[PDB]
């Protein structure tokens, strides 16, 4: 007889849960509701990370799993399946299953951590003047609002701020134009601020989300490639 | 050793009761995966592995395959498929 | 049927991967109640803490969770699904996953709650002191003085304040500029060596800081006076408290520090200890950076005793931590008084190896007994000029 030791219990979700994932990197159990939402749960003390929609279509049947061997997380919802691994410690869940647009004017969820959109309000009110831009206001006051709403859980818990996101729900356009003008202005005021990298990958990723706007790599002789584009690593490799 | 898919799957035919009655069997169905550089081509069958009779009789369906930590050894899990 | 568990084999026959028809185990569910739901297989390694394929954990459909071994579908562990709050209903166990964290198996109930189950539940030793000064003994004890260089990788997380054998760089944030916590786990439990900490100031630093820095056990989870956050953790101190002054270069701008205690050594011989903590604080009796903001950029590599052919060497490390008698012998083959032969420079060599082992790792002790440093600075000093006499004049460089 194998001999095994209970030492209590802890209470996840109300729903009930179907299926769980334990993330070996960050220690977080992602144990998955049979409502779609992803509860994430350090494994340290016992309390809930943070909570996620994934982006997912409502009413889908989502389906977890971890792959320590590649360190991926892939969710298979009722229509598409999505890959996830962790960035600056935390697994950006919101948009982990969202369908990639077909048009810029379409709204895409786009989810940033709390230090990346405090350096771009600072930039955005101090240092960056893109009030000409498209949906310059809109997005300052979703800034304003998602700053303000998480800087009360980042004065309370250190690992629920670095776990808490800043959603935007946004045009593709408007967050492409916001994207660009920001990188311009930084480049063009020649000011060494973490605004500017947070900015090319908000406007990589957008563009990655969008399968219309990839011109072919020209790669050959005697042929210039555009460098504004060229910005991501993986057109450099 | 070029990689390979292993699908398990739940195969519904009719046959004549020995009307058609529909019949159902899992099998597992390995394909090649790594394309040319005779070595099958990607998408089709390498190795139809037939699942023993108990499978068959009860109706049952794949439900989990996992490789052990071995490497050498291979466990498949079999549950009751749902009639329709 | 509550299902079925059928083990093939892997076949290399041929180029192709390809597998065999005959399995070789066949397992029948008798139980409709017990069906298989979700696996986990527990690497066999876990329980050291037909050759064995490990065990799986399963839950059924009526929550029940069972560990067999792999290799005959034994049932070996059963555990019975908790009752809900407030009622006699089964909280079946839905799926299980292991989690390494608290070394338990996490499954999910119906009612969404999540559960853990724990699996698991100096004399008689041949010191290396008794024995007299031969050249093999010696020579062992020198193979067992050496370090090693930990691969892969390691696990270690630092406030947000630095940004990245590890280098971070530091920024400007006064959020946490006094305390300063650096958690480390080691990716195995072996034999630990002692961690370098390299530092690099301002390059406009005309008076040294008061800062310092100290090794911490970090504490397992529940189942001139120090800063207030090392006395929390007084009783679990492995090293220091040793101050920025000793290890400054000539420049200013870098350092060194060399973490180990015999503490340390004496508390692994455990063979319980897995993770640690780096604490550090700026301790007062432009960029106005005080303390710890002066740090510019921060470097970390950890080492490992070298693993030798002589088995339980955890006994034989803390033997002459212990038993400090040795050393007096020590100092008599270094004043050559021993009529055991004459000591030639290669045995002397390795005395002054050991002496310098000795030395070094005892160079950080954090609130220990003195009585042995004691004993042997004792008999140094009782044969001071002997020892110099033999070592500077009577030995080669």
Redesign the interface.
Known sequence: ??????????????????????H?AL?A?L?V?SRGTIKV?D???GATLQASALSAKPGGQVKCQYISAVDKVIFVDDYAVGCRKDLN?ILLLDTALQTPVSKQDDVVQLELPV?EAQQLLSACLEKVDISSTEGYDLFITQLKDGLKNTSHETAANHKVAKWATVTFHLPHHVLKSIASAIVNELKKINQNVAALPVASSVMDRLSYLLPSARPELGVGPGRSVDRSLMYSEANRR | ????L?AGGLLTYKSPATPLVRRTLPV?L?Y?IKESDV??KPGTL??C????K??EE?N?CI??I???????????????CPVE | ??????????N?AT?????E?E??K?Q?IKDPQD??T??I?L?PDILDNI?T??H?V?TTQGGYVK?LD?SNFEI??K?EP?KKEGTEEQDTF?????????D?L????????????????ISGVDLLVDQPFTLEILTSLVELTRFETLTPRFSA?VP?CWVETRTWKLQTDSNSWDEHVFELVLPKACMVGHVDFKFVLNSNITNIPQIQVTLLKNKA?G?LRLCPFLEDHKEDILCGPVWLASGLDLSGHAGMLTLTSPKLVKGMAGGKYRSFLIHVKAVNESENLRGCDLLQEVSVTIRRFKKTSISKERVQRCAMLQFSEFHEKLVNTLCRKTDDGQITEHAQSLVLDTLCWLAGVHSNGPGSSKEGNENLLSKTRKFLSDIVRVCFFEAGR
């Open positions: 007889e194998w001999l095994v030791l209970r030492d209590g219990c802890m209470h996840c979700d109300a729903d009930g849960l179907h299926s769980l994932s334990y070996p220690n159990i144990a509701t749960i494994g340290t003390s410690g230090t | 050793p070029f990689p390979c292993l597992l390995l090649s070595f099958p390498v190795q592995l037939r699942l023993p108990f499978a009860e049952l439900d989990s996992t490789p052990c930590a071995d490497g050498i050894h291979l466990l498949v899990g079999l549950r009751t | 049927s509550g299902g079925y568990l059928v083990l093939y084999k892997m290399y180029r192709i991967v390809t597998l028809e399995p070789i066949i029948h069906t298989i979700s696996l297989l690497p050759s394929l490990g799986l399963i560990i792999l070996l562990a555990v908790p839905v799926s299980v996953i292991y989690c390494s964290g608290t338990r996490c499954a999910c109930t119906k009612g969404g709650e999540l559960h853990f189950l724990q699996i698991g539940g997380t947000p989870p189942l």
